[PDB]
């Protein structure tokens, strides 16, 4: 029976090559870095809940070791890994892959791993929960992770949860919400990944009676025109989300207690060069290219600060929310070192209930209301 | 703060623009900035109402309605004549639900039920769907102006103006009455809509009139033609059904009405002139639909208790005492039709009068007017529907002579070409006159099309594709799949010599645009599916468990683009095609000088190149600095699951002598790799070196050429199997496999036992086995020189050193090669030379040959040395040389 299913995989495979892509017939093609699938389960479950019978779905593992001893555990051991994901009953792929380091792997899988059209559009990735106490270097690294993850056009997907990473463990995503809401903060235009990612969850048997909010921003004196210009897209895309919220305050200054946390929070990684050129920062970065001058702090106040007043309005929102989903800014390759990325990412995402997914597409549209 | 939130960063808020696509209002499109923009550095529309609600309910209405619905009430009973409308709306309800659903999906646009059938389903049978349906509404067109021609001879006949005959006369007034629709049609969708408002005006002032003369106690004229008013008798006597006739049987009048009332798709078929399709398709036509068939059940109901079946019409035909006899209760209205009831002659009643509707009515002339504006709104919406469908379909450009009638003259497209082309068709069709041996072909044709929206909505539904998000929400896949078998079942059963000719006319046109190719790609339930497919089955391959009995050559082919190493893809391609996964790498090093949609745009490009090359394989680069990190990046990561490569087939440097030594210590490293990771390595080399379809020495047969195979190893069986594969092809069937097993004349049989009669069990059938003991026997001396000489250049004269001065020399030129080493492995240098020469001899008009691939230690032997013994291991061997080198795994 096996020769029999394998010719059958072969030939539809082969059979997709023909077939173009089109926008209309567009699928997440998420590759998840879960490395040993059974430490984080959770994250495979959340994919697989809206992989699930639509799109492709394949599990990172990078090793660190030779080859030599790494073969034999490598071939007896991917195997093992493949029943504990059928045992689950995921329709995920796994794939292991060895480097020196775990973004090399990273690197290697998102330039190779796929057959043909059933190739990887998506890099879910779990947050660094020790960020700050891990060695700056591995901050450092994860942050050029998503830089690579963004040079191939792979759609990133940054999932943090308060609990953290790690018969099978039962997570949170087994379970079924039931009437909790679904808040979408569209602050940007991704493509509308932010939207089809929660749209396909609440297609699921366990996510049908949540009720989605989006949530967008306006200014205060054209709350209502702008109310419905936004309710109006979504009805073009007819995704069937409920409520759209506004939000004009989000420029405000965030408040005196919370803006000094954030810069609290990264005083350790301040490289404390705000007087100088930079032809004359980077030999004080060679050994530490995460440190921040002050230079690169002046020119992001306002960004910096807006982050947490965001972490302000969805912690005054999304306190009891089955699911929370927000944009994933974007930091610029030279002007935006690892440690000012990641506080972002943790300021924005904190402080509350989190199943918080910070997705960002790759400002290439996967919503369309315009049959061709 | 009080600014327009996205004013003080480069990246923007989601907004309508961003996604249109259509001349969106502003002079200009504001597009999100590129993710290499972030990253990196440095007419008048009408309404529901108007425009599908009154039109579909003018295309339902037709002549039926008014001579043949109170036949078919007084034959069959109101309870069955009820039945029957009921089940002919649930096959129009049905498909109404499916064609709502599918017009909810995206934004509709002109063309119709052929744009929204050739969209969702796909451009095959979209192409074949549109011409079908536009040839059914051209002849539809004539068919109901000749009806109505029909009623307008009736009606002059009735005053005396033959002017011909009652044939070959409704000719001349119907090509009138085409020409005065072709002319209005022309005029502009404003006229016609105002056309067929005043066509439903029309048809109210005769349903009103019909309805209050019911209720108007009997004349005597009336009463004497069995119109008798509203009474309890004559409701309870009609409820059975009194079957008469050669038509007296149900699925008779089943087959009478079906027809009458399926064109639902008049709102739909004028999509493109529509303020809001989405909104204004599904609500009107189901409207349509519901108002039809309330009036249907009325009528029904009303002229059932009023008219008896049998009536006289003869005044004398008083009741007076003792005179005639009466059977029933008809009398005690004081008329008595024994006369006739014995006799069966008179022609009055409801089921010998089909005109009985306009005798109940209050005024004949108002149901006349009635008849003639049902049947013109048929006829102009038939050849509204036809000419844009078929406009569509030219625009399209799907079929190779349509192309001239798709362009649209005036303003607001205004199709007069194809206007032109449907009134020649309607005329030329009605000038025939002979209808009645064409119209159930166009019937089981507008089935045909029913079924293929119905399954276009479930294949839809069931592929659940993400684009697929559909505003109406009140369908059903099941419910579309059943109203698809049951359209295609009543095609069947309505006339089944019909239907095949229908099916069969469908079928040859869908195979002719599946033949033709169309470029055009549309995005469709189809190619979702297809994917849903793949996805599926690559799956259930990855659940399966791993042993032994599965193995398959899974080749990975270190081509870098297809197109300039042809002969190595097609060697890949002959043992591979249909039994194996095969993938085509290539490795870029470059800087890559581009952001990844160039290179997503050549990788396509290279794919539809391999595919037009008739290859199943998997176009796969990546790209890294140096080809060994790239041939390591793909054999680590290529592949999916369990159909991973398991074998790395490489091409032959032939040029390694004069390029720079780094280069051949790549290649060996790659080599080395490959052996390392487990990887079965195969060296094709070419005489002439691996570097519209360029032609290789793979493609042309070769007759009956010896397959030499130069066993000297066991590797697992690799050596043997490839050629073995490899000769099961029907242009290597002639081929006779003379594998020159490594051995001894005493073990002809043991090899043979143990792989060529063992192949006898592996069905390989090497027909000669001849030994070639003299491997080991001292080469000639001037091979011997052409090899010591090929390795002179890269002589390293480190013999005359120590052990740890022999390392340190190599930390920067590893690729040179120390004497010592020469001394240390002479008798495997010499062995090559000798071998050489044994092929040489022996192989010289073979067709293809394979020799065990040497393989050095790492360390223990040289790059560059070990590189030698390849070149001279075939060196001047006229065939393509392949060299072989298994993963150690016994394959059979
Ligand atoms: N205009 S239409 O395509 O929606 C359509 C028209 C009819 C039609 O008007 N109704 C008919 O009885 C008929 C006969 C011949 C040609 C056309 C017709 C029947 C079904 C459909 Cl789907």
Same mark, same amino acid.
């Given at each position: 029976?096996?020769?029999?299913?394998?010719?059958?995989?072969?030939?539809?495979?082969?059979?997709?090559?023909?077939?173009?892509?089109?926008?209309?017939?567009?699928?997440?093609?998420?590759?998840?870095?879960?490395?040993?699938?059974?430490?984080?389960?959770?994250?495979?479950?959340?994919? %697989?809940?809206?992989?699930?019978?639509?799109?492709?779905? !394949?599990?990172?593992?990078?090793?660190?070791?030779?080859?030599?001893?790494?073969?034999?555990?490598?071939?007896?051991?991917?195997? &093992?890994?493949?029943?504990?994901?059928?045992?689950?009953? !995921?329709?995920?792929?796994?794939?292991?892959?060895?480097?020196?380091?775990?973004?090399?792997?990273?690197?290697?899988? +998102?330039?190779?791993? #796929?057959?043909? $059209?059933?190739?990887?559009?998506?890099?879910?990735? &779990?947050?660094?929960?020790?960020?700050?106490?891990?060695?700056?270097?591995?901050?450092?690294?994860?942050?050029?992770?998503?830089?690579?993850?963004?040079?191939?056009?792979?759609?990133?997907?940054?999932?943090?949860? $308060?609990?953290? *990473?790690?018969?099978?463990?039962?997570?949170?995503?087994?379970?079924?919400?039931?009437?909790?809401?679904?808040?979408?903060?569209?602050?940007?235009?991704?493509? #509308?990944?932010?939207?089809?990612?929660?749209? *396909?969850?609440?297609?699921?048997?366990?996510?049908?009676?949540?009720?989605?909010?989006?949530?967008?921003? &306006?200014?205060?004196?054209?709350?209502?025109?702008? $109310?419905?210009?936004?309710?109006?897209?979504?009805?073009?895309?007819?995704? %069937? @989300?409920?409520?759209?919220? !506004? *939000?004009?305050?989000?420029?405000?200054?965030?408040?005196?207690?919370?803006?000094?946390? @954030?810069?609290?929070?990264?005083?350790?990684?301040?490289?404390?060069?705000?007087?100088?050129?930079?032809?004359?920062?980077?030999?004080?970065?060679?050994?530490?290219?995460?440190?921040?001058?002050?230079?690169?702090?002046?020119?992001?106040?306002?960004?910096?600060?807006?982050?947490?007043?965001?972490?302000?309005?969805?912690?005054?929102?999304?306190?009891?929310?089955?699911?929370?989903?927000?944009?994933?800014?974007?930091?610029?390759? &030279?002007?935006?070192?690892?440690?000012?990325? +990641?506080?972002? *990412?943790?300021?924005?995402?904190?402080?509350?209930?989190?199943?918080?997914?910070?997705? $960002?597409?790759?400002?290439?549209?996967?919503?369309?209301?315009?049959?061709?």
């Amino acid at each position: 029976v096996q020769a029999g299913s394998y010719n059958l995989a072969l030939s539809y495979s082969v059979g997709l090559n023909e077939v173009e892509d089109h926008i209309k017939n567009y699928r997440p093609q998420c590759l998840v870095l879960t490395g040993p699938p059974n430490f984080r389960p959770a994250l495979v479950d959340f994919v %697989g809940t809206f992989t699930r019978n639509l799109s492709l779905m !394949i599990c990172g593992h990078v090793l660190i070791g030779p080859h030599k001893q790494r073969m034999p555990e490598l071939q007896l051991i991917a195997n &093992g890994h493949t029943k504990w994901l059928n045992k689950r009953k !995921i329709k995920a792929f796994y794939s292991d892959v060895i480097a020196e380091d775990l973004r090399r792997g990273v690197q290697i899988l +998102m330039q190779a791993a #796929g057959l043909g $059209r059933m190739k990887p559009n998506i890099l879910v990735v &779990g947050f660094k929960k020790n960020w700050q106490s891990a060695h700056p270097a591995t901050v450092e690294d994860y942050i050029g992770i998503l830089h690579d993850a963004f040079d191939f056009n792979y759609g990133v997907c940054v999932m943090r949860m $308060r609990e953290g *990473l790690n018969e099978q463990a039962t997570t949170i995503f087994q379970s079924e919400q039931g009437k909790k809401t679904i808040d979408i903060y569209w602050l940007f235009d991704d493509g #509308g990944l932010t939207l089809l990612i929660p749209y *396909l969850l609440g297609r699921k048997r366990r996510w049908s009676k949540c009720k989605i909010r989006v949530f967008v921003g &306006g200014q205060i004196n054209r709350m209502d025109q702008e $109310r419905k210009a936004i309710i109006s897209l979504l009805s073009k895309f007819r995704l %069937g @989300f409920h409520e759209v919220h !506004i *939000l004009p305050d989000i420029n405000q200054n965030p408040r005196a207690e919370h803006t000094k946390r @954030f810069e609290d929070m990264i005083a350790p990684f301040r490289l404390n060069d705000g007087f100088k050129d930079e032809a004359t920062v980077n030999e004080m970065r060679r050994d530490c290219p995460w440190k921040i001058s002050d230079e690169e702090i002046t020119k992001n106040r306002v960004k910096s600060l807006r982050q947490v007043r965001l972490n302000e309005i969805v912690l005054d929102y999304s306190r009891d929310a089955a699911l929370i989903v927000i944009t994933l800014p974007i930091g610029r390759k &030279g002007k935006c070192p690892s440690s000012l990325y +990641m506080a972002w *990412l943790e300021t924005l995402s904190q402080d509350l209930r989190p199943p918080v997914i910070l997705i $960002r597409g790759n400002q290439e549209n996967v919503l369309t209301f315009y049959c061709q």
